[PDB]
């Protein structure tokens with residue numbers, strides 16, 4: 001087979017990070033399908049080969065596991081699927097239609113990679129232990145492997161959603177109202193909270209538009225990514241609030257502040273769920289320490305970092321916890337953050 | 342001279358970190374002066390030699406500067422001063438009295454090491470530049486050099502303050518009321534704020550004693566260290582609040598929360614001084630980036646880390662900033678954190 005050959009070749013190239021503007025240009029109209037095809041048939045084999053080369057450089061005890069071999073098999077097949085289109089003609093509509101169908105198949109093939117890689121982490125802990133050095137190496141690899149995955153699934157979604165044969169550009173909303181996404185994520189977390197706990201904290205939202213007070217806060221962003229982060233934070237904050245007030249009657253509300261500055265758009269979620277000692281904060285972001293026979297926070301932080309943001313937690317044991325999503329306010333500063341190969 | 346010989350010998354030993362309990366035992370009574378002398382005449386040459394060996398391993402362009410040579414000369418003389426007492430007899434009261442006088446001299450000799458090392462940083466920036474690699478190496482060294490200094494000045498203060506010929510044990514207050522220290526630091530910052538700005542924010546304090554509600558929060562700590570941290574944070578928060586509301590009439594108060602948990606004692610200072618973009622947070626803790634022709638925060642964080650605590654900043658650009666001091670609530674968990682040699 002030529003799979004090792006392809007990996008070596010395309011690993012020589014560096015991934016090309018795209019900005020929000022570039023995403024909006026690719027999706028401005030259906031006339032750009034050919035340009036998207038020409039870009040992706042080269043870029044997707046590059047990004048796939050770079051992360052596949054890093055997988056092959058893992059230690060033999062990790063590389064020989066069934067989880068890694070299964071994931072690697074799905075990365076080899078996806079690579080080969082894209083390679084078939086390198087010599088095809090963009091002017092042929094059939095070539096473009098087949099490319100879209102191939103991307104949907106590739107996306108579905110990798111839909112279970114996060115629980116599979118979690119199974120591998122649990123196997124490692126039981127087979128070799130949970131030492132700190134192992135934690136760092138696993139954290140280093142999975143952060144890069146999951147950020148690569150996010151970037152590859154972003155490109156695929158933009159092509160398939162737009163070139164399917166407007167206000168929203170695929171998964172990007174150029175006028176995303178942050179408060180509405182906050183409400184949506186709270187409402188979903190509330191439904192689950194009421195069902196499992198028979199009680200739910202209320203929600204309070206306050207907006208601070210520094211430059212234009214009393215004007216609703218909008219941004220260019222991927223609302224599905226923002227929902228995923230806010231949903232995970234709401235679930236954790238509601239659980240802590242309800243469980244810490246089981247023997248009390250008052251249930252403190254969850255308070256969200258949306259602040260718009262000259263370059264940051266910040267979203268703070270404040271709860272009074274008893275808080276967490278500082279010693280345990282790092283474990284909440286660790287894949288290995290959160291694994292038990294709990295990746296919402298570490299993956300949520302990767303979504304924030306994907307467009308040059310961040311997600312941070314600061315708690316006060318005995319009182320409550322604050323969780324801040326830092327996003328770039330300006331589309332010019334919103335650029336893909338890809339793993340440094 | 343035997344100075345290089347002494348450094349090599351005592352650098353072989355590891356510093357011995359002490360706990361709060363051990364500090365209270367050394368200072369329980371004046372009868373323990375002999376034990377303190379026997380411990381310090383060995384421990385102080387160990388800690389001095391370890392940081393002196395690291396200084397000698399700096400690159401020649403840093404080591405040859407007048408600032409480092411001056412500091413190193415003060416570390417060689419202080420070492421030699423302590424070496425004189427190694428063969429002396431602890432039972433002789435004159436030996437003990439002379440040791441105390443020697444420690445006061447050593448302490449005063451090093452009183453200007455923080456502005457001197459700041460002069461060296463400014464010289465480096467102008468002579469070789471402010472590249473990121475230089476920033477990391479300088480940050481790594483100064484954090485260790487300033488934490489060593491804090492630990493050596495703690496030992497000296499405990500001996501000189503107690504064995505000078507109770508409620509407080511030297512610089513340690515076994516019943517430190519945190520809120521009172523907060524008020525003291527605010528009052529000092531307010532005086533300076535009113536003098537320079539003709540306006541000052543008010544103060545609001547709220548205590549959360551999770552285990553014993555409505556009971557004042559006390560701890561075993563060094564109130565002078567806590568004051569230094571709170572004073573620096575108050576000065577920065579007041580400056581930002583006043584300057585960000587110059588064209589407004591309302592001046593938001595600075596809100597402090599003191600929370601006591603099972604293992605953390607947390608102090609949050611919240612202001613509405615307009616906040617800071619996330620990109621600038623790391624620069625606030627950098628010695629090199631805060632140097633201009635501003636070490637309060639980086640040194641304040643070292644005071645917090647000295648007894649296994651921390652100091653963290655999280656801001657919301659366009660609104661305000663939160664600054665949290667994390668301390669250990671229990672004296673059993675309060676142990677010296679020394680540089681890993």
Ligand SMILES: N#Cc1c[nH]c2ncccc12
Nearest residue numbers: 233236237240276321323
């Ligand atoms: N995210 C988040 C959290 C928000 N509050 C929490 N309390 C305990 C543990 C995690 C959390």
Ligand SMILES: N#Cc1c[nH]c2ncccc12
Nearest residue numbers: 574577578581617662664
């Ligand atoms: N410490 C601290 C600060 C608290 N608020 C601030 N605003 C701007 C810059 C630094 C700070």
Ligand SMILES: [Cl-]
Nearest residue numbers: 110111113149
């Ligand atoms: Cl994947």
Ligand SMILES: [Cl-]
Nearest residue numbers: 451452454490
């Ligand atoms: Cl010093």
